[PDB]
């Protein structure tokens, strides 16, 4: 109920499972974005070399 009021969702329609799945996908996209940025910077440095 506190997280339903926190994320401004309907309390009778919030499920914790899709909330945590959205956070799981957001963390996976976060790590994939960091990995792609690191690979892009490494390949740009290798191309400049």
């Amino acid at each position: 109920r506190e997280l339903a009021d926190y994320l401004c969702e309907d309390a009778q329609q919030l499920s914790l499972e899709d909330t945590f799945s959205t956070m799981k996908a957001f963390r996976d996209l976060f790590l994939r974005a960091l990995k792609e940025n690191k690979d892009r910077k490494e390949q740009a440095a290798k191309a400049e070399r």
Binding site: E2, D5, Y6, L7, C8
Partner: protein, 84 residues
């Protein structure tokens, strides 16, 4: 204090990030995260709008080694020759 809404308009046409917008009265709850962001003492990050406007806007409208052979037979001859 509406610090999040105090953003300058952009010069160029921007690619629309689609989202499901909340109602305002739902966002002004007591336990709301956006209510804690609406306090001016919270930590705010100033974005660099110049690079976002730069990138995510819409776009607008010699004879060294001469040979008489072809390259396939010449490279086959190079493989044949360089093993000697």
């Amino acid at each position: 204090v509406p610090s999040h809404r105090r953003v300058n308009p952009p010069t160029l046409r921007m690619k629309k990030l689609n989202w499901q917008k909340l109602p305002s009265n739902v966002a002004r709850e007591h336990n709301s995260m956006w209510a804690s962001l609406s306090s001016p003492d919270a930590e705010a990050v100033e974005p660099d709008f110049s690079s976002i406007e730069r990138l995510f806007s819409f776009p607008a409208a010699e004879p060294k080694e001469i040979t008489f052979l072809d390259a396939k037979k010449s490279l086959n001859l190079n493989i044949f020759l360089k093993q000697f």
